[PDB]
């Protein structure tokens with residue numbers, strides 16, 4: 001049993017992950033694979049962490065998940081240099097995700113979520 005908000009967050013997450021077929025952002029970045037990461041990025045974020053916050057009913061709004069998604073992309077553009085594959089992939093994923101999490105779409109979900117209460 002999940003709330004209408006949780007299920008909306010899940011379908012949004014499914015579409016966001018559709019824009020990352022390489023699974024660069026599926027799991028947390030470790031210092032082992034990216035040395036000094038924990039010293040450079042103060043608020044790490046990834047898809048699996050966001051999915052756990054959905055599962056635990058941590059998000060009170062779609063905008064909070066939108067904030068976490070922007071943070072995950074921004075983190076990769078801080079740690080990685082502009083020509084790297086990870087920077088370019090985060091740049092493109094952020095732009096694609098902002099179209100998915102547009103105000104127009106958040107609108108429609110808020111009303112249907114409200115109508116199920």
Ligand SMILES: COc1cc(-c2cn(C)c(=O)c3cnccc23)c(OC)cc1CN(C)C
Nearest residue numbers: 023024025027028029030033034076080086
């Ligand atoms: C290339 O393969 C991967 C890359 C990254 C990765 C992501 N981001 C955002 C980074 O900034 C980053 C920076 N340095 C090194 C690696 C990464 C990854 O993160 C956990 C996992 C894989 C393995 N994958 C098959 C699951």
